[PDB]
Amino acid sequence: HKSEVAHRFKDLGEENFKALVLIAFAQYLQQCPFEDHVKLVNEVTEFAKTCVADESAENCDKSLHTLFGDKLCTVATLRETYGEMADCCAKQEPERNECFLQHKDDNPNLPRLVRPEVDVMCTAFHDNEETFLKKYLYEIARRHPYFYAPELLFFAKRYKAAFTECCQAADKAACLLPKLDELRDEGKASSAKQRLKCASLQKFGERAFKAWAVARLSQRFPKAEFAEVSKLVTDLTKVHTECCHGDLLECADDRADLAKYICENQDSISSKLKECCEKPLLEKSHCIAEVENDEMPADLPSLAADFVESKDVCKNYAEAKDVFLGMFLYEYARRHPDYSVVLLLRLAKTYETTLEKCCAAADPHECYAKVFDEFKPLVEEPQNLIKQNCELFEQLGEYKFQNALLVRYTKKVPQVSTPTLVEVSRNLGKVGSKCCKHPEAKRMPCAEDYLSVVLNQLCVLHEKTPVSDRVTKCCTESLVNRRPCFSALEVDETYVPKEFNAETFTFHADICTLSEKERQIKKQTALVELVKHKPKATKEQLKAVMDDFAAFVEKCCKADDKETCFAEEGKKLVAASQAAL
Ligand SMILES: Cc1ccc(C)c(OCCCC(C)(C)C(=O)O)c1
Ligand SMILES: Cc1ccc(C)c(OCCCC(C)(C)C(=O)O)c1
Numbered sequence: 001h002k003s004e005v006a007h008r009f010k011d012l013g014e015e016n017f018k019a020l021v022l023i024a025f026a027q028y029l030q031q032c033p034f035e036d037h038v039k040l041v042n043e044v045t046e047f048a049k050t051c052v053a054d055e056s057a058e059n060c061d062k063s064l065h066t067l068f069g070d071k072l073c074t075v076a077t078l079r080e081t082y083g084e085m086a087d088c089c090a091k092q093e094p095e096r097n098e099c100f101l102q103h104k105d106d107n108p109n110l111p112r113l114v115r116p117e118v119d120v121m122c123t124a125f126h127d128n129e130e131t132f133l134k135k136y137l138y139e140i141a142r143r144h145p146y147f148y149a150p151e152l153l154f155f156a157k158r159y160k161a162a163f164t165e166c167c168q169a170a171d172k173a174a175c176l177l178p179k180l181d182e183l184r185d186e187g188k189a190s191s192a193k194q195r196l197k198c199a200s201l202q203k204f205g206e207r208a209f210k211a212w213a214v215a216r217l218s219q220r221f222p223k224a225e226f227a228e229v230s231k232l233v234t235d236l237t238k239v240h241t242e243c244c245h246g247d248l249l250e251c252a253d254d255r256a257d258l259a260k261y262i263c264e265n266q267d268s269i270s271s272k273l274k275e276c277c278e279k280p281l282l283e284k285s286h287c288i289a290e291v292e293n294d295e296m297p298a299d300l301p302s303l304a305a306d307f308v309e310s311k312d313v314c315k316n317y318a319e320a321k322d323v324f325l326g327m328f329l330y331e332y333a334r335r336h337p338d339y340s341v342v343l344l345l346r347l348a349k350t351y352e353t354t355l356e357k358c359c360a361a362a363d364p365h366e367c368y369a370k371v372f373d374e375f376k377p378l379v380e381e382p383q384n385l386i387k388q389n390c391e392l393f394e395q396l397g398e399y400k401f402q403n404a405l406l407v408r409y410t411k412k413v414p415q416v417s418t419p420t421l422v423e424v425s426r427n428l429g430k431v432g433s434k435c436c437k438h439p440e441a442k443r444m445p446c447a448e449d450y451l452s453v454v455l456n457q458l459c460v461l462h463e464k465t466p467v468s469d470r471v472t473k474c475c476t477e478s479l480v481n482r483r484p485c486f487s488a489l490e491v492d493e494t495y496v497p498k499e500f501n502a503e504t505f506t507f508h509a510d511i512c513t514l515s516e517k518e519r520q521i522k523k524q525t526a527l528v529e530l531v532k533h534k535p536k537a538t539k540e541q542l543k544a545v546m547d548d549f550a551a552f553v554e555k556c557c558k559a560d561d562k563e564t565c566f567a568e569e570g571k572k573l574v575a576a577s578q579a580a581l
């Protein structure tokens, strides 16, 4: 209205406003120390409060984009520190705003953030809670300058909950450390998913995006009508396109506007939105993105009527193909919330191929008559992969599951580096955890969401140490072919066992006192190495060498002459194994 800064202040509230302003500057002034940022926040906050007191006070009618840039431009070492960024200040708005968007830093070469000791954290949290929370807010934002600010704030609030609860329990570290572990992983996945969505919008184009969204929205809002779903999809395409361009306030406005539309139209969308639609602006859109699926309408027709039997299949289709294809997607997805989106895209692509062929025939009905038979194999390939894999995760536990993967994937592509093999296999294990805990109906969606980041991370690592043609092929396959391509790779039978290195298999009882995390990685590294030298070992025959180590490392670790037990029985464990494999 009259004062944008006043409006935002009154809507977010002071606490939220302060945290968001800190995030906003942190992501642009990535090198300025925490103290300089607290300074800007307080200066910006004092000015806001003057505009809340009196909306027509001086400078209160300036745009928030204008006020943000001005404040960026008053930083004294701007030219010194950020170089080219300072030349943005020589421009008029809106070219100045656009100039700042281009000069952030994806890789600020800052040191790794080190998790202090539990008691060092709980005493810092008790002493100056705000200073403690906000510094960590600063450190994350400057390292993820593209992370959507409100989402980062919601994480911060969770961090607060964990420290509040655990810094008072008997075993602090037992309470706090799994929580820190979950939050970090979930924040890393959210960050990768955000950048991957924008990368996918450019790589694959707007058609692919609309197809994906139709399917997803139809699963979540099965009672909505096609036209309403398609109207939602049109807007979300704008929103994602704006957000990916990078301007935080424009992204926030577009998201907030969509949430308002949806909340003013719950009757046409979903019966599960009531609670989200009571929450304050800051949380509404995030709440909606996570709402559970509506119950689908009872007693829906077979898709056969409108898509196989009807006389006007080919006539309906040729009039507007993507509309007709999107109605198919809509009708299939609403009945199938248990499917992955990509599966639904494979079915729609199958239907599209058949109509392209058969609508040219003299008797289209005769040609496309058996099109639904073509769906059965596509549906069962990923259901079988889920059922089977999730049986093993229920049958081994995370760690042993992880070990089974290491063997499988090293045997498949034994040229991949050991750290990549280890990182990715461990992550795949964690996909098991997040997803096999869900009932059938939620399995394929869960696996799809997390696989997409895990497999992407594997591909990104792979572009930079390319050892395998077959891996490269799957990383540059189509959207729908990527995961099936991975699943299809055969064991490398034409491989050459890796040269033996005595040191690689040598443990120096360093092992008995390491964190369990490190003990796992070390065991897992060697397991990979084991398989890299002896690729031809058999299931039951490997379990042999593995169970030698099982007992070995246990007896040479019980306090005593550790040092030479790992020197003696070790050369004894190496030698027995080479001849046995
Ligand atoms: C092919 C492609 C290209 C670009 C993007 C962003 C894609 O993801 C769709 C966004 C998913 C959405 C709509 C946010 C949801 O699940 O609610 C897919
Ligand atoms: C660590 C690594 C190295 C090399 C490859 C090829 C990997 O592929 C993982 C495919 C995962 C999936 C889709 C669940 C499957 O097994 O079918 C993994």
Ligand SMILES: CCCCCCCCCCCCCC(=O)O
Pocket (backbone or CB within 6 Å): 020, 021, 024, 064, 068, 150, 248, 249, 251, 252, 253, 255, 256, 259, 281, 282, 283, 284, 285, 286
């Ligand atoms: C310098 C002022 C920067 C202020 C940025 C904070 C406003 C962004 C949050 C808007 C609330 C969330 C909207 C939404 O995503 O639904």
Ligand SMILES: CCCCCCCCCCCCCC(=O)O
Pocket (backbone or CB within 6 Å): 340, 342, 343, 382, 383, 385, 386, 389, 390, 405, 428, 429, 431, 432, 435, 444, 447, 448, 451, 483, 484
């Ligand atoms: C290795 C553990 C990962 C979790 C269990 C395997 C999941 C199989 C994936 C099936 C669905 C993938 C999505 C798709 O391509 O349709």
